[PDB]
C-alpha cells in the first residue's frame, strides 16, 4: 500500500487491491521487444512443456517481494531492481507471452 514503486504499482495494476500477492516481477522494456522473446531461445518450461522462450539479452526488471511482516490490508513490498534474462511461456496467435516462467 503506497510510497515505493512496488507498493504503488501492485495496487494500481490491481494485484493488491483485494489481497496481498507474495511476489511479482515487472519488466521495463518496450512491449514489442518483450513480445519478441516468443521467437527467441526455445527452452523447456519448469512443468516440462516446451512453449517457453528465453530472451537472448538481459532486460531491466523490478522484483517486488512481500516483507515477512506484510499483512492484508496493508501489503508491504521490498523493491529489487535487476537486469535478467526473462523466460516466458507463449501461446496463441499472435504468439505472445502469457506467463512468466523465470528470470536469469
Amino acid at each position: 500500500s503506497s510510497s515505493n514503486y512496488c507498493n504503488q504499482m501492485m495496487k494500481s495494476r490491481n494485484l493488491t487491491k483485494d489481497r496481498c500477492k507474495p511476489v511479482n516481477t515487472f519488466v521495463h522494456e518496450s512491449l514489442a521487444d518483450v513480445q519478441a522473446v516468443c521467437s527467441q531461445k526455445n527452452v523447456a518450461c519448469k512443468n516440462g512443456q516446451t512453449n517457453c522462450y528465453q530472451s537472448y539479452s538481459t532486460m531491466s526488471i523490478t522484483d517486488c517481494r512481500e516483507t515477512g511482516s506484510s499483512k492484508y490490508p496493508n501489503c508491504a513490498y521490498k523493491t529489487t531492481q535487476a537486469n535478467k534474462h526473462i523466460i516466458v511461456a507463449c501461446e496463441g496467435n499472435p504468439y505472445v507471452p502469457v506467463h512468466f516462467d523465470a528470470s536469469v
Partner: peptide, 15 residues
C-alpha cells in the same frame, strides 16, 4: 474479460 495475453501485460509490463 481479460485474455491471458492482456493479463500478462497488466501484471508484468511497465514500459
Amino acid at each position: 474479460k481479460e485474455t491471458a495475453a492482456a493479463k500478462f501485460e497488466r501484471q508484468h509490463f511497465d514500459s
